[PDB]
From a paper:
The BLIP/CTX-M-15 complex was determined at 1.4 Å resolution in space group I 1 2 1. As expected, BLIP binds the protruding loop region of β-lactamase, and the BLIP Asp49 and Phe142-containing loops are inserted into the β-lactamase active site, consistent with inhibition of the enzyme. In contrast, in the CTX-M-15/BLIP structure, Asp49 is in an altered conformation where the carboxylate OD1 forms a hydrogen bond with Ser235 Oγ while OD2 participates in hydrogen bonds with Ser 70 Oγ and Ser237 Oγ. Phe142 in the CTX-M-15 structure is in an altered rotamer conformation where it interacts extensively with the β-sheet and omega loop residue Thr171 but loses interactions with Tyr105. Further, the structure of CTX-M-15 in complex with BLIP shows that the 103-106 loop of the enzyme is in an altered conformation compared to the apo-CTX-M-15 structure. Upon BLIP interacting with the 103-106 loop, the hydrogen bond network of Asn106 observed in the apo enzyme is disrupted and the peptide backbone between Asn104 and Tyr105 is flipped 180°. For the CTX-M-15/BLIP structure, there is also a change in the rotamer conformation of the Tyr105 phenoxy group coincident with the change in orientation of the 104–105 peptide bond of CTX-M-15 such that the Tyr105 side chain is angled down the active site and makes a hydrogen bond with the BLIP mainchain N of Gly48 and hydrophobic interactions with Ala47. Examination of the CTX-M-15 apo-enzyme structure versus the structure in complex with BLIP also reveals that the Gly213-Ser220 loop in the helix 10 region undergoes a conformational change. The change is associated with a movement of Thr215 mainchain O and the side chain of Thr216, which forms a hydrogen bond with the mainchain O of Asp49 in the BLIP 45-52 loop. The finding that the 103–106 loop is present in the CTX-M-like conformation in the apo-enzyme structure of CTX-M-15 but in the TEM-like conformation in the CTX-M-15/BLIP complex indicates the enzyme can sample both conformations.
β-lactamases inactivate β-lactam antibiotics leading to drug resistance. Consequently, inhibitors of β-lactamases can combat this resistance, and the β-lactamase inhibitory protein (BLIP) is a naturally occurring inhibitor. The widespread CTX-M-14 and CTX-M-15 β-lactamases have an 83% sequence identity. In this study, we show that BLIP weakly inhibits CTX-M-14 but potently inhibits CTX-M-15.
Numbering used by the authors:
A (entry chain B): 1 to 165
B (entry chain A): 27 to 288
The structure:
Amino acid sequence: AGVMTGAKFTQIQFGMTRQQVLDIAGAENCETGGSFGDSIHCRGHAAGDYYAYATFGFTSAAADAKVDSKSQEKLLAPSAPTLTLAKFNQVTVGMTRAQVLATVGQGSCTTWSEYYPAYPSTAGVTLSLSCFDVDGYSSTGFYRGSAHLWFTDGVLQGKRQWDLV
Amino acid sequence: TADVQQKLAELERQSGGRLGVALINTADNSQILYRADERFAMCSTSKVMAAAAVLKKSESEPNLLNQRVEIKKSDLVNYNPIAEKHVNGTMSLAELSAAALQYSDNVAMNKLIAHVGGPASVTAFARQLGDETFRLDRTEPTLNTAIPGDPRDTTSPRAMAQTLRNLTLGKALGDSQRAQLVTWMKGNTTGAASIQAGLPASWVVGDKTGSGGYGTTNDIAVIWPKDRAPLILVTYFTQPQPKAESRRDVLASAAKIVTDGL
C-alpha cells in the first residue's frame, strides 16, 4: 500500500534480492533501466521538483543479485536532530564515523547513501550522511540547516554544510 | 482581458501569496501579463537556462554533449537522484543536461553552471539572448532560498517567457540544439501537477518546475495546444511564510485561467 516510505526503506536490507526489494517497496512505485541502469529506483511522495525516493543497487544485473547500495532522500527523518554550525566545525576530516556521530549528535543524521563495493565484505564501504539541525529537515520542502558528511572505510573524507547556525 | 486579470488577482488573493504570470500566444503574439515585471526566484526553472547555455556552446564545439564530467562526493548536493549513481565516475554533458531537466538533479545543474564558467557566465548567456532581467548568482542548493526582496537568482515572468520563446521556438539556439532542448523538456518526470494540470490532456507540454523556500512554486512551459500555434507560459508563485508548503495547484489554476477558450 502507498508510495515508497521510510518504513519500507528501513525494512529493506543489504543482501536482499531484487524481488525482495520489490516485495517491500511495492513494484508500482519502482522502476529500473534508463538513467538507473540495473538499479531499482522507488518513488515516494512528491517533494520539490521531484519526489522523495530510494535507489537500490545490486551486486550484478542477475536475478540472484543482492542489495549492495542503499540511497534515499526525504524518506527518513532524523530521530533527534541537534547539529549546529559549531558542532559541524568540530567535525574534522580523518575522524572515524563513531567520533563524527558523537560530535554531531546520534540523532542528527540519516543515511543518504551507503555502498559496499565488496559486499558482503565491508572493505571499501562508502557512506554519505545527511545531517540536520533541530528544524533543518523537511520531507517535502527546502532544507533549513543541513550537512553532508562522507566517509570511506569509516573515515571522514569531507564535510559540507548549508544554512547551519 | 480585464476578466483574466481579475481572475488572476482573485486566485492570488485566495492563495495568500504573490503570483507572476506571463503567457505568450504565438498565433498572434498576444500576451497575458500579471506582475510580469516583478522579480521572482527562479529556483529550478533556471536549469533551462543552464542547459541552453551548454547547448549554445555546443554550436561551436559539436562533440560537446559527449564530453565526460567527473562526479565526486564533494559535488553532492540534495536532489541528486541521477548523479548519485555516478559518484567516483563520470557523466556526459548530455546526461547532465537530461538529468537536470528531467529529474531536476541539482548536482547536474551545478556541473552545467561550472562548465560554462559559473553563475555569472549563465547570466552572460542570458544577456547575449537579449534578456536583461535574468540573474543567476548562486549554485545549488542556495539559489533556492527565495527570500522576499532578495534579487539573487531571480527573473521576471515577462523576461522568462520571452527567453523561453526564443530558446524553444525562436532562433536563440541552432535548429538541432533547439530540438534537443524541446526533446529534453518534453521528458520531465514531474510537472503534471503544475501548468499541465490546468490544461486539456491532449495538449503537448514541455515544462520545467521550480520549488524553493517561502513555498516558492514555479513552472515554465512551451505548450502545443490541439490544432493551434504554440504558447509560452511562465507561472511563478511565492508565499509569505519561510516554511510554506508548495502550491502546484495555484500554477494549474493560473494556467487554466489564461488558456480558457483555446
